[model samples]
Structures are given as structure tokens and as C-alpha cells.
Target chain A: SLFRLDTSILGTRSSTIALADLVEREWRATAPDPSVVRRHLGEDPLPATVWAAAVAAQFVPPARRAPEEREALSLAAALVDELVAAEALLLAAPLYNFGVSQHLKTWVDLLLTDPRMAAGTESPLAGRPAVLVTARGGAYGPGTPREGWDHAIGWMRRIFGDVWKLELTVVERELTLVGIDPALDRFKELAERVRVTTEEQARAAGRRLAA
Target chain B: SLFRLDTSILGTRSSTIALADLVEREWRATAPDPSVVRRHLGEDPLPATVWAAAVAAQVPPARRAPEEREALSLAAALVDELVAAEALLLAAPLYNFGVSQHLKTWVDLLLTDPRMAAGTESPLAGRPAVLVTARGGAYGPGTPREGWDHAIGWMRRIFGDVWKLELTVVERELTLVGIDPALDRFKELAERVRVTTEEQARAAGRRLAAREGAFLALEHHHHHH
Candidate 1:
């Protein structure tokens, strides 16, 4: 079973979710136990402040921490436990203002607070597969007007690949604003091509995940 | 009255808020009417769906659902607050090494409106904006986690390059020192950096209020990666 977290505010209208749907289809087709647990972060409250406070309280020595602080620490541990049980992870993160959604970042921040996922410790999800799917409203690739502008994908790569030690793969598509914006109409064909290619890649990755 | 948006989850404990407090203090010192219109995003109850619906409702003048119309107007009300302000003050601290979700959700919703979207002149264009940010670790060169402060760059690009706001950014690094034992060695350096950034923040506030202060030198505004 794979844990899929969709953080795009646009729901099904989001290209990231579209890519995730493709991957899920392929995974379902191949996996013997194809049940996928889903968390729609955009629709649900991730309680960033609570988790942030919880993580901060961890800095307090155990003897000095209050009961509330201890509870906060346990909450982080519970979250880690839930995540470690998943066979793989599917994260659909749409770029907002040139970066990952704060919801996704908050979840990641809270997850890392657990000693199991702390830096310099053995990452609980090490070797587990994770597919990070992302979509950008405009192109930030080479020669684009906003070249080197993308700050989302690379950070996710670092967190999942380097920090958590997941066998991470990324499937990205750009210019998602093509159909939505008249200004980007000129890039419609290219956008469609990129979108289709990413969906294909998502499917291929999902197949590999189920192997 | 000054316009201020607080997006830090930590509230009083946030370093970004501390920097903004200094800016606000300077602004209040100069202005005759020191009244402020403050919006604390972290405390806001509105979900992102409302903003999503508001943006989607922008498709022509049709018989819109009452809820969509209400949502759209709510978005308009927020934008109007920005438009009416003489200057914008935003305290955006880095959380999870990225922009605050509350602020991003608001920005994303605002972009759904035609007035705030691309191809339209942003209402925020030409306005003076002060963005105060704080990061727990150092992302400067030679540091172990160099180039990790991802939130500030995107904010500069959006507020300065995209919105055309005359932007000034005050950033304080190494905020985790006393809290994270691993970062204790850098406490003195962090304190120094914080003090200097706070001083710069006051200068920025004075400049924005006076509207005659010399522009601060641009180090990363145009050339930063």
C-alpha cells in the first residue's frame, strides 16, 4: 500500500494531481495489495502551528518540558509511525509562488522532528520508494524568462533523497497556466506535450514501484 | 494607517515578527496617524478552498453561486486593504525551509483574481514593501547548509520582479541557536546578525515612511540566484 498526499489547492484541476492519478492507476494495476491511503492536505488541516510548536518544544530537555510539550512530542512520533508503515509515498505538490505548498513543507517539517527521521540518524523510510510529482504554472527551465526560478523540486529532492533517504524519483511538468491564461496560449502545444510526457513517466514510475 | 500582514506561525517568538516590530516602531515614530490595519494570517480560519472558489469564479459575469460571489468579494476586500495602504509590511519567516503556507495560500488566492494575475498590472505595483524574514540555520556560503534559504529568494522574485513592488528585504539567519544545542557555537554570530538586520529593518521603515531616504544598495535583488 502507498500513502498518497495531495497538497495542491486546486484539487482535480491541478496538474500535479493529474500526474498523481496516472501513477496511482499504474500502481493499482500491478500491486497485489493495491490499497492506497490518501491524505488531501489542501482539503484537510495539517495544523502547522501545532506541529511547529511541538517541534520547538522538543528543544526543551525532557526534565524541563511540561505535559503539553510531552504530548506534542508524542504527536510527532505518531505521525512518523503512520508514515513508516506505508510501502511507498506519492506526493503531489503544485508549485505556488515558485515553491512547494506550505502544507507540504509543514508536513515535512513535522515529520523530521521525530528522532527516527532526524538528520544524522537512520531515516525510517530509507530505501522505501517515493515519487514526488510537481507542476509549475509557468516554465522556469533553461532560456525561459524565469530561468533558475524553480525552488520547489530541488528542495524536495534534498528532503526525500538526502534527508529521509527515500529512493526518490521526480516527475515534473511546466507551463500549467497554458490553458488557464491567455498570455500562455502560445505555449499550449508545448505545455500539452510536457503534460502528456510527465503522465507517461508517472505511470512508468508507478509500475516500477509495484515491482 | 500602515498595512501589515503577519504570517509567522510562532507569533511572538518569531524572529521575523521581531524584525517587523522594529520596522513598525520606526514607522510609527514618523507617521502622524500611527493607526494600523493588521491581518494575522496564522489566526485566520478561512480555508484555501474558499480562495480557490473565488479564483475559479472569475470566469466572466455569469449567474454565480452566492457562496462563490461571497468568496470572491472576500478576496477583493483583502486586495483592497493592500491597495489602500501607504506601505506594506509583511513578516514571513521560513518554516520547513520554505514560505509560510498561510501567506502562500493568500497569495495563491489573490492570483486567481484577474487584477492580481499575470498579464494584468498588479495592484501592488510600485508600492513600497518591506519583507522581514528569519531562518533557523545559515544558508550563506561556506556554511554546511549553504544555499538552503529557499523562502527569501522566491519572495523577492514575486514581490519585486513580478509585482513590481519597490522591495526591501531584511533577513536574519542562525535563529535556532539557543534552541538547538547543535547550533550553540554560532550564538554570538547569530546575535550579531540579528542586531544588524534589525538596524537595517529600522532604516527600511524610516525610508518607506519618509519616501525620501536614499535607496539601500542592491546586493541580491537583481543578481541573486
Candidate 2:
């Protein structure tokens, strides 16, 4: 079994909790600081919450800081160390406006910093398996009433692929109600497809490594 | 000059600060009470510096909230009110790992709330005279680095234009540095652009009113590469 990390920023509970249970049923789920690299930014001590600890100081200005903040360069380096070391990640997140959560993005910022991911243009975070379980309240899919949701995913995929180059699978159009059940059901089907694809990729990687 | 409201969630200082100066120099810039909104969520205040305050009690978990939150009927009403009211918005934002900020996004959530935007199929925030100033440390115009910051403007335009909304003149670039000198120069440029954009906004409102294709595309400005 490979090392699996839940890179979700959906608080500790909620949908990520459900995904965490599923992962534990299959693999060992490690409890790590969400902002693993942010810890080096000048320490006032690690925050109890995974999300808060990473963003605690990092020079956000007027957004809660103890003093000095971690420059983007160092943070990005820490993110690479955290993400690349992991074999698989389960991202349980909901679309805030049109994309992933703030914490997820903040972590990505650190990962893509020019100093840390100099080769990001060529898939620095490639080879790792990722399954993104996203829940949005809207009843939108590609070519649907809310078509832009997919637009958000388009950019998300490009960034994940090009910046860190992680093997990505997306499950969108999930978790909607009120005249959206049909779309939600369709989205679920797509999600299942993503799950299968991710599993297949992981198996292939495992085989290649073993060989 | 026309009005511009920054809908970004980068705290009063981060998201709306640059825009405020633009408004201060020419148009008026306004932002809703983020601290007040954060209080309603009972979470740490956003921008991490203010006390949260609320005027209403939290409802018993939304048994039907999801339905209401996901419905198009809800979004329709929101759009009707927004463009009809003719709101001017300027979004000063931060890149969250090469994407738009979440705090500003919550407002978008509310605006397109199922009860408001109907999944943005019928967007209503397109009343012209809106500007977006997305910010970051290095990602600037035509940097050839990646499509991190630039993508936000396209998203905003699509969301705003879906319901036949038009922008007077859209400015979709970032000013590479956060220093006062850099910002001051951007403001000088913004003030000049404001003159042309306000007219375009007015023109779109009058000519494109009710016409599907009447909405005009926004003109952009790129400072740092």
C-alpha cells in the first residue's frame, strides 16, 4: 500500500470526513499539517486546526499574523516536499464560487512558487494519483444551465497538470438538489468514472515501480 | 464618474484597497461589511483583523436549504434585482494558488445563490461599469509563466455576461508590485480609463438593455508582465 494523504481543506469534518473514512477503509490515512511548509515561515507555534496553522502568519497582512510572514518562495518549497513525498491524495472539497476552497488554493500557491517548482511547466507533481471529490450546490454540468462550473474545472486541471503535474481525476456536478437531481445523478456517474480511472492509473504506476 | 464596488474577499485592505484608491481618484468604491458577514458564519473574521458581528440567528441546519440553495428560480430573482439595481463593482483580489480569492467568491455565491442566479445561466450582475483588479506578487500580464491570474477575468466576464449583462470597459490585468509607487501609477491609469469606461457602461445600459447581444465586451489593461 502507498502513502495516502487527504489533501482536502473542508475543515476536519463534512464531506472530507466521509472521504477519510472511505480511504481508511482502504489505506492508512496520515494526519499531517495542511500547511506543512507554512510552519517554517517563522513560528508562533503550529495552529491546532490544519488549515489555520498553515495560514497563521505567512504575511497575509491585516489577515492575522504574529509578525514576519513566510515568503512565497519558501512556502512553495515546503509544499513540494509535502506533496511529492505522498503517493496518493484524496481531495474532498466543494466549489466556493466556481472552484476549490481557499485552503486548497493557498496550498497550491506554495507548491507553484517559481523557486520551488521551477520545472512545474513540465509536470513537477506528476506521477502521483489524485481523486478530487467536489460538491457544489448548483445544478450545473458541461452544456447545462451553469456551464461555467466546468470552466472552473478546466483551469483547475491545467494548473494541477502543468504546475505540479499530478495525475488528476475530478468528480463534479455532485451534491445538488432542487431541480438538479438528474444533473447530480449524471455527475455521480462521472465521478464513478473518475474513481475508476484514478484506480487504474495507480495500479499502472505501482506496476511500473515494481518492474 | 460611475460607481465601482469591489466584490473580492481579500479583506478590506487586500481586495478592495487598490480599487478604493481608483474610486477615490475618480469613481466611488464601496464594499459590503465582510466582518459582519463573517460573524454570521461564526468563523474567524476574514482578513484576520476585525471583530465579527451578526444581525440574525443561524437557522436550524438547512434540511431544505440545499434545495433552495441549488434552485434556478432562486437565482433568477437575484439576477433581476442585481442588474435592475445597476450595481457597479470593482474586484481587488488575491490569487489563491493562481486562482481568485474565496472571500470574494462567497459574495458571488450569494449573488448567484440558487435563489438568485439559477446557476448563472441567467446572470444578473452585468449592469456595465464594473472593473476587476486581480492582484498577486509576480503573476502579471503576458508573463508567459502560466494562466493563473489571467483566468480570473475570463471567469468573471462569463459569469457577468451570461444574463445579457455588459461591462463598460473591463480591465483584467494585475499590477506586478504591491508598492505604493506601483499602485499610484496604476491609479493614474485607472482614472484615465474610468472616463472612457463610464461612458461605455452607460451606453451598454441604454443600448443593450433587453437585447441579448447588446452587451459589450470589456476593454482590458495590462501593466506588469
Candidate 3:
């Protein structure tokens, strides 16, 4: 079973989704009865207060938690329960403002609040195959003027790979705004080159996830 | 004029908020009439769907569904809080090893509006801004979680590089020393860090007060790019 999380606001047009969809398809090809439980954060986000409520519930006795806190705690537990039950994980989050998607951050915060997913606790999903497909609208790689500006990838790796002990693989796509933003028109060919290679990389990573 | 944004769920007990409150107080002392605008995203978070909903509405403006248009209105008000401030005080906290959802949601929403979009001239260009933030764990070089201080770099990209704000960051680490048993050994060091950062926050506040001509004099500063 795979727990696939989609955090793109652009729906079908999203680059992250395009990459993750290919990953799921590859994984599905290897298994006749593939099971993938998914959550689309962009289409329907959790309540704004869920993370804060879940964290606040830590100080109170379970029975004494406020109504909202109780609901938040239950939701956090369920989120982790699904994660733990899965044999693999897939997360597709877009880079927003040089950081991870807001919805992804909130989801992560809630998971961390759960004792099972806490920072130094034994990782319930240790060694499980996990793939993160992320896309950035601009170039922020080595030698680029905005080198080191894309902070989303490293942070996501720290959480899912280091903290959760997942056997992690990352597929990063950049210069995605080439066609959308007029400022990037000059780089369309460069973006096309990168895109072709990135798609190949995504497929390669997907095969490994299935393996 | 100052735009103060508090983004700590811990409220009065939050280290980031304490630092920002100090920054605001110091800045107020220097102004004969301080015009301060405030928003507390932690206490009153924007709807989680506001950003995504606004995105759906904005791509085709003037024909949005009523609900989608309503979401855009909230995002517009957030941009309003950002305009015309001489200085900015952002009290952001690191949560789960990255940016707080509250602040990120605000940023996500802020960008949905054309006024705060990329390629547009920054409304806050060259303004002195103080970012007060803290981390629960130490992420300096040689630490087990070295290079994990994800919050600061991302904020610098947005505030300094993107918006071109004259930014000063007051950051503290080991904030969970007394609370988390694993960090008990660093309690004293945490206090020292706390004091040093608090003092830095005060200085940043004073810098905001006297920043009217500082950026103008050296306005076209070298960009790291």
C-alpha cells in the first residue's frame, strides 16, 4: 500500500502532479492489485487551527481536551495511522515562496504532533520506500543567481528521510514558469532541455520505488 | 509606520513573540506618533483554502464564483496590511523543522493577489525590516541536524531578495532546552542565546526607527545574485 499526498493548487496543470502521476503509474504497473490511499490537500485543506489544536492537546489530558482539540488529535492520529499502515509513501508538493507548500507544512506539523511521528521517537515507517516529487517555478540550483534559494527540497528530505527514516528519493523540476511568466520567455529552450531530462529522472525514480 | 505580524501559537510564552514585542516597544519609543498595524496569524489564521481558492479565482478575474471571490477578498486585505509601512516586524517560528503553516499560508495568500505577485515592483522595497524567529533545536554546523535551519533562508529569500527589504534577522536556537528533556543539558546556553538575541531584537527595533535615510544613502546595495 502507498500513501500518496498531493499538494498542488493547480490540479491537472501542476508539474508536481504530472511527475507524481507518472510515479504512481509506474508503481501500479509492477503490482496487479496496487493500493494507494491519497489525500489532495489543495482541493480540500484541513481546518486552519488543526496543527495548533493538536499541539495544544499535548498538555491536556486526553479526556479533558477541548472539543476542537479532540477533533484535531483524532485527525492527527488518523493521518499517522494511514502513514504507518502504508508500505511506501509519495508526496507531491509544489515550491511556494521558496518554501514547501503551506498545506504540506500544516500536514507535517500535525503529524509531528502525533507521538508516533514525533521527532526522536522510533519512526513507525522506517526504511519504507518514499518519493517526493517537487517542482519549482524558478531556477535555484548550483551556479544560478538564486542558488540555495530553493529551501523546500532540503527541508522535505530532513523530515521524510532523516526524521521518518524513509528510504527516500527526490525528483526535482525547476524552470516550470518558463512558459507562464513572460520574464522567463528567453529561457524556454533551456527549460525544455531540463524538463525532458527531469521527466526521465522522474521515471527512473518511479521504477526504483516499485522495486 | 510599522507593520507588526505575530505568528506564534504559544502566545505570551513564545520566544519569537517576546523578541518581536521588544522590537516593537523600542521602535515606538523613538516615534513621536507611531502608527502601528498588527496581525496575529497564529491566533487568527486565514482559512486553509484561501490561497488555493484565490488562485482558482484570480486566473480568471471578474467572473469568479461568489465564494471564490470572497476568498480573494480576504487575500486582498492581507496585502493591504503589507502596504505603506516604513518598517516590518515579523515574528515567525520554526515548526516541525520548517516555516510555520500560519506564516506560509499568509505568504501563499499574499502572492495570489497581483499586487504581491512576482514581476511586480515590491511595495516594501528598501524598507528596514526585523525578522524575529527561533528554533527548538540547534542546527548550527557540526550539530546532528546541521543545515536544517530551513526557516531563515526561505524568509531571507522572500523578504530581502524578493521584496528587497533591508532585512535584519534576530534568530535564537535551543528554544526547547528547558521544555524538551533531551535538551536539558543546554538550558544555560539557551538562556545566554535568548538574552543575546533579545538584545539584538532591541537594536533591530532602533534600526527601524532611524532607517529613514540609511537605505536611501546606500540604496543600490550589491545583490548576492
Question: Residue by residue across B122-209, what tens digits does model 3's lDDT show?
Answer: 8878777899988888888899977777888888888998889888988888888888898988988998998898889888888888
How well is each residue in A90-182 modelled by candidate 1, as lDDT tens digits?
A: 988887767667678767777777788765688888899999998888888888887868877777887788778899889988888887778
- Which candidate number maximizes lDDT? 3
Candidate 3 iRMS, in Å?
A: 0.9
Whole-structure CA lDDT of model 2: 0.42
Please state the error at residue A107 of candidate 3 in Å. Answer: 0.6
lDDT of 2 at B15: 32
lDDT of 2 at A198: 42
Candidates 1 and 2: which is better by DockQ? 1
Tens digits of per-residue lDDT for model 2 on A97-178? Answer: 5554444544454454444464324554567766554555555656777665543555566566555566776544344442
Candidate 3 wrong stretches, greater than 4 Å: B213-225
Q: How close is each model in CA RMSD to the real structure? A: 4.8, 10.9, 2.9
lDDT of 3 by residue, A103-200 (tens): 88888888888888776679998899888898888888789887888788889998888888899988888899998888889889989998998888
Per-candidate interface DockQ score: 0.41, 0.16, 0.78
Off by over 4 Å in 2: A1-24, A28-66, A70-81, A110-115, A118-126, A135-142, A171-211, B1-24, B28-86, B93-97, B102-126, B134-150, B153-165, B172-225
lDDT tens readout by residue for model 2, B1-225: 233344343344443345344433332223221111101111231331010000011123344344433443333443344444443444435454344433332343344344343444544543544444544333445655445553554445444554444554334333443344534546655544546544443443333233323333533556677
Q: Looking at every candidate separately, what fraction of the true A–B Cα contacts under 8 Å does it contain?
A: 0.35, 0.14, 0.84
